[PDB]
Amino acid sequence: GSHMTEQPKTRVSVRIYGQDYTIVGAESPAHIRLVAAFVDDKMHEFSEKQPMLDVPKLAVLTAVQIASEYLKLKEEYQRLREQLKK
């Protein structure tokens, strides 16, 4: 058998809320480490608030907030570059 000189999207196993998950990182080995911590910490800060008082309602709450707080960031990049092209 032969091998191909390619490096596709690598996956990594992290631990969030006590459970282990293997998702696609595709970035620095030190970066993927803070990814899990960011979600874990965010879930922890909301667990003490008890929004809907349920586990699935906790993880989904952080998921939607993480997306919104980051959407505004990527949006700036699009607006900033478009203004530079003007």
Next chain:
Amino acid sequence: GSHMTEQPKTRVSVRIYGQDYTIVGAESPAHIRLVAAFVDDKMHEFSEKQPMLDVPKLAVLTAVQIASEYLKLKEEYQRLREQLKK
């Protein structure tokens, strides 16, 4: 009676995975609509994969995934911007 002329971060209620959730969304009316759909869609597409065969585990699974694909985006943004200041 008095009214302060201020505009803080507004909150929005959306239906994610069937349940209603109210989170912070001061970006834009149309933008905040796709935020819920982003998680809802990603969760639904993973629901057929049955990675952990559990809803709570699925919600956090997509959360870390979304963060991973968006974190590298804000990073690239900072890299190209820093090289433009050389």
